[PDB]
Amino acid sequence: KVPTQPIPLMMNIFRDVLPTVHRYYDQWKERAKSIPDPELRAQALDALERKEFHCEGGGIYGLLARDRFDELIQFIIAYQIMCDYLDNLCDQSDYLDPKDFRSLHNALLAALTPGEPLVNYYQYRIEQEDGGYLHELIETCQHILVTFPSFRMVQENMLELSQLYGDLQVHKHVVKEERIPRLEAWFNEHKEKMPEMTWFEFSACTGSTLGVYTLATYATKEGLTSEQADVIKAGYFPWVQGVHLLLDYFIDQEEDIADDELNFLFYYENEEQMIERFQYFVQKAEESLSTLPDPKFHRHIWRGIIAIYLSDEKVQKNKELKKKSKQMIKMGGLPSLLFYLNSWIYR
Amino acid sequence: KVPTQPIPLMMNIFRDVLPTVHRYYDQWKERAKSIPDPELRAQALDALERKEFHCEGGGIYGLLARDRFDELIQFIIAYQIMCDYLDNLCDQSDYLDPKDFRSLHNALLAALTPGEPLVNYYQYRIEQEDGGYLHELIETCQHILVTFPSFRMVQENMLELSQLYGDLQVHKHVVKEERIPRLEAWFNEHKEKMPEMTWFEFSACTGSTLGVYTLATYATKEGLTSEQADVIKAGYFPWVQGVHLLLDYFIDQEEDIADDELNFLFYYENEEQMIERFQYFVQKAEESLSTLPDPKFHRHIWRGIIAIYLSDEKVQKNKELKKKSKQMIKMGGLPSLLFYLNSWIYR
Ligand SMILES: CC(C)=CCC/C(C)=C/CC/C(C)=C/CC/C(C)=C/CO
Ligand SMILES: CC(C)=CCC/C(C)=C/CC/C(C)=C/CC/C(C)=C/CO
Numbered sequence: 001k002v003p004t005q006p007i008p009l010m011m012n013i014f015r016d017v018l019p020t021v022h023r024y025y026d027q028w029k030e031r032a033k034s035i036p037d038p039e040l041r042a043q044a045l046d047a048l049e050r051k052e053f054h055c056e057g058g059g060i061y062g063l064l065a066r067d068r069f070d071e072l073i074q075f076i077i078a079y080q081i082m083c084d085y086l087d088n089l090c091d092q093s094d095y096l097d098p099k100d101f102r103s104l105h106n107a108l109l110a111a112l113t114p115g116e117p118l119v120n121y122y123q124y125r126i127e128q129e130d131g132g133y134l135h136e137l138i139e140t141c142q143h144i145l146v147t148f149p150s151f152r153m154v155q156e157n158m159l160e161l162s163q164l165y166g167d168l169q170v171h172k173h174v175v176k177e178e179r180i181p182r183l184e185a186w187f188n189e190h191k192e193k194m195p196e197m198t199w200f201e202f203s204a205c206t207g208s209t210l211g212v213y214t215l216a217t218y219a220t221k222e223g224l225t226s227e228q229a230d231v232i233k234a235g236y237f238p239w240v241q242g243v244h245l246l247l248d249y250f251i252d253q254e255e256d257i258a259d260d261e262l263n264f265l266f267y268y269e270n271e272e273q274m275i276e277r278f279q280y281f282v283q284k285a286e287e288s289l290s291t292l293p294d295p296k297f298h299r300h301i302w303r304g305i306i307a308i309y310l311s312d313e314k315v316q317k318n319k320e321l322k323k324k325s326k327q328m329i330k331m332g333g334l335p336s337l338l339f340y341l342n343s344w345i346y347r
Numbered sequence: 348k349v350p351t352q353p354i355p356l357m358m359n360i361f362r363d364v365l366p367t368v369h370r371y372y373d374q375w376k377e378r379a380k381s382i383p384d385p386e387l388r389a390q391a392l393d394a395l396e397r398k399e400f401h402c403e404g405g406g407i408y409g410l411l412a413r414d415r416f417d418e419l420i421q422f423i424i425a426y427q428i429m430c431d432y433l434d435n436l437c438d439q440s441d442y443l444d445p446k447d448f449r450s451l452h453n454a455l456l457a458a459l460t461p462g463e464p465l466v467n468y469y470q471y472r473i474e475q476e477d478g479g480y481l482h483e484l485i486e487t488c489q490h491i492l493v494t495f496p497s498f499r500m501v502q503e504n505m506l507e508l509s510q511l512y513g514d515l516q517v518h519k520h521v522v523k524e525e526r527i528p529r530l531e532a533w534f535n536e537h538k539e540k541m542p543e544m545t546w547f548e549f550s551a552c553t554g555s556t557l558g559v560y561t562l563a564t565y566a567t568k569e570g571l572t573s574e575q576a577d578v579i580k581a582g583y584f585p586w587v588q589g590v591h592l593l594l595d596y597f598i599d600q601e602e603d604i605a606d607d608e609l610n611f612l613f614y615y616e617n618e619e620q621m622i623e624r625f626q627y628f629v630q631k632a633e634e635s636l637s638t639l640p641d642p643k644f645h646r647h648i649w650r651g652i653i654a655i656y657l658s659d660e661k662v663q664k665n666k667e668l669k670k671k672s673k674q675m676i677k678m679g680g681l682p683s684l685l686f687y688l689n690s691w692i693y694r
Contacts, residue, residue, distance in 0.1 A: 007679060007680045007681060007684055008680055010684055010688070011680050011683055011684040011687055014684070014687035014688050014690070014691045015687040018691055019691075332354050332355075333354050333355055333358050334354060336358050336362070337354055337357055337358040337361065340358060340361035340362040341357075341361050343361070344361050344365055344366075345692055347369075
């Protein structure tokens with residue numbers, strides 16, 4: 001059974017999760033260095049250099065599936081490395097071709113489809129020589145998921161989340177003036193299936209990978225039901241994924257204002273509405289998490305997400321953002337403790 | 348309104364205590380570089396390089412005296428720097444002259460005696476040109492303690508603990524064959540005023556500086572009575588200071604065996620008696636700490652100190668020492684958590 005008390009949970013993270021994540025992550029970093037195309041190589045290494053925390057955090061789900069610990073972490077790390085690599089490729093495109101963005105994000109759907117034939121995902125861009133990097137990441141996922149006893153029960157839900165994630169990455173990276181019309185028209189197709197929210201709130205809800213890792217985790221269990229697959233998806237989507245990305249965008253505000261970059265928080269009528277809706281998402285997130293198996297573990301993952309995000313220098317070294325962050329959610333001073341602990345370690 | 352819950356306590360330590368200690372400690376490092384005598388300079392800088400954790404730990408007492416935070420920490424740092432410097436000078440003496448050891452440790456008594464004229468503390472050794480390093484550490488303590496409204500009420504108790512500490516440093520640093528005879532004669536002078544214990548248990552009890560820092564902390568209060576000053580002294584001496592040094596000796600066993608260093612645990616008739624007496628010290632220490640003002644603070648700091656000691660790789664990587672440590676004190680998974688956290692940071 002998973003640790004649900006802080007001390008054993010933290011001990012298992014430092015002893016088991018982080019060394020196991022880094023065993024595989026550090027192997028991908030060595031592979032990325034051998035990418036022949038200098039632009040693909042740079043984007044791969046930048047994602048690996050800057051976004052380690054995504055894999056370190058995602059790997060914590062390993063604790064729910066000890067019998068498949070190494071394999072589940074290898075899947076989460078391969079899938080998350082792909083997301084961060086592809087995000088860099090889309091963010092750094094000089095061409096802004098949505099066919100390219102889509103073709104790249106179809107790699108994530110291949111990763112979730114064992115025996116899906118691998119295509120040239122780079123077919124709509126000039127840079128295509130990755131020495132098999134992307135194919136190796138896809139095949140890693142394919143070969144692991146197929147060994148999970150209830151993968152077939154969760155696969156449809158994983159693909160639904162991955163498709164929504166890919167759609168977001170396509171629409172938000174096109175030429176500035178075409179982004180919001182695409183996102184609004186895209187939201188309009190899903191809004192009937194969704195709780196009452198805005199196009200930009202929906203956009204945030206689709207931008208997380210947490211639901212995919214949670215479904216992959218429970219895929220390791222014998223006799224998972226279609227009913228439970230659906231409970232597990234609904235536990236994270238839309239509310240938890242929403243809070244995750246609303247925080248990501250909260251922390252990235254000052255660089256988005258300065259770099260004229262798409263930030264979903266900027267489409268709220270005012271700050272009062274933003275804080276009120278954020279608090280609503282948090283309450284709905286707490287309610288959705290409580291429906292899950294191992295609810296106490298999920299509530300710990302979730303508190304950890306909020307705390308680590310709000311501990312960012314961008315929040316804690318900005319008097320205004322720090323004040324507004326405590327208005328959004330009170331965390332018993334954990335964000336500040338993590339900032340000052342971090343600040344002490346690296347000096 | 349002193350922080351006692353783990354998150355706010357830890358946040359204050361990382362935000363307030365450690366950065367403030369680091370600032371004053373760094374200023375002492377730069378001051379030490381100006382020591383003219385090459386050997387005194389080498390010993391001052393070595394103590395400062397190796398023993399910063401003593402000041403980091405001692406400074407946590409600042410949180411009991413928020414009004415006097417910076418001044419109390421400057422006192423604690425100056426006193427502890429002096430202790431670790433003098434320890435080095437006595438350790439690395441080629442002549443092992445107890446007159447030298449005594450004269451050096453008389454600096455600690457001067458530090459606790461404002462308006463006292465100072466001697467040449469180096470008067471019994473070859474190396475004497477420190478450019479005022481030791482005088483400035485003394486004067487730093489003297490100038491801070493006079494500003495504490497209740498210093499006069501705790502001064503006698505502080506001088507008592509400082510005298511016994513000085514006595515221990517004198518007796519333990521002489522030639523190997525004179526150490527135990529000196530330590531037994533010394534204990535025999537104090538035996539009748541102490542709870543029942545061995546000369547080597549007594550030696551352990553006198554070797555900590557916690558009592559001095561705690562007394563200095565409550566010196567910052569208006570209208571401390573003699574009764575209260577005696578309660579505060581008894582809260583740390585002898586049981587808490589005893590646990591502190593017995594635990595230090597416990598962890599360093601393998602080191603002290605192979606470097607043939609003096610270790611007071613080796614004078615127990617066997618391991619079983621050593622563990623039995625340690626458990627007794629722990630109980631008396633818990634009892635004496637519970638008599639203090641802010642008893643949850645004192646309990647939390649003491650458990651933190653124990654957890655940090657037991658997290659040492661010397662304990663956690665040594666199956667035998669790990670078994671004995673878990674007999675000696677029940678800390679649950681905290682030492683193991685701190686071990687794996689440290690292992691991760693410094694991989
Ligand atoms: C009891 C405690 C403190 C538990 C710690 C819980 C932690 C560290 C959770 C990390 C949160 C997490 C899963 C982050 C992953 C980030 C991710 C997948 C980002 C993709 O954009
Ligand atoms: C919260 C942190 C990182 C504290 C660091 C400080 C450490 C490691 C302290 C452990 C030792 C300690 C509390 C010593 C007290 C000072 C003293 C009298 C030392 C002489 O043995």
